[PDB]
Amino acid sequence: RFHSFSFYELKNVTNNFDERPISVGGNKMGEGGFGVVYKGYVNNTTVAVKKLAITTEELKQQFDQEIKVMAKCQHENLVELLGFSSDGDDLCLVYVYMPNGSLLDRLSCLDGTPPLSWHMRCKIAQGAANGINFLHENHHIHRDIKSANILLDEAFTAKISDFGLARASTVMTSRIVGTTAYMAPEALRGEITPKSDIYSFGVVLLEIITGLPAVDEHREPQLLLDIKEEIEDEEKTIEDYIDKKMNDADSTSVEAMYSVASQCLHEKKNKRPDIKKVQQLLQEMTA
């Protein structure tokens, strides 16, 4: 069901992979560890084209791993692969365009976008949990859950992205991959489990509550997961950290979200809630 592109087609529709940012008149919209994301225009449709940039064989394995997961993983809250380019030296993945970009950039109001309302933040968290539930229900571990990997369409529907590190689902690995500021302690040690996705989602819930990135070079505490200490050690309250760029943050619902995040962020994996419980708790917050 995926359209095979020749590489030259993608070169043509991405202004020959103009690496300049969109604002500078280029085609680059963002980047990750595994490739650079470009805006493309194919058959009157705006698309996202990720050109993959780790040993070369491993890059191909991740390329195909995204294809295999995407082939079986279709959901409202998962980004949709449209096609690929495997011919040529470079590897390309073509996705449905997401007009409102990443949750990370929207939380930071990048490029002048308005602050997200608390009501929309709750819907986004629910949508993201629905996507993770689909992955876990179909026996997949994302392994890179983070706000940069939660994309938003024109209606701000949340869509989980980047299944290159995804795995089927005790099991350990020589390769520790992920985003350290979001990873569970067991994941930092090479353990591979769906419970590590829950911990990373807890950091995301914290980013949503506070509007702060998971790590900020010029910030103390520099890691957001550390603020869970100040709350439990009574050094600070969740009030002190609630994003001030909001006018509709009911205290009860916000404290409800911190509770879900706190449970997700227990260092012991087996004490973490499962995704269905996380779904249930998040639904109960808006009820």
Ligand SMILES: CC(C)Oc1nc2nn([C@]34CO[C@](C)(C3)C4)cc2cc1C(=O)Nc1cccn([C@@H]2C[C@@H]2F)c1=O
């Ligand atoms: C987060 C970055 C990397 O992506 C985007 N940023 C955007 N910023 N803006 C706007 C518009 O007006 C603004 C003020 C600037 C917001 C629109 C965007 C669309 C995207 C996009 O469609 N991005 C992906 C779609 C599908 C998949 N993947 C995964 C990487 C794999 F391919 C994507 O990254």
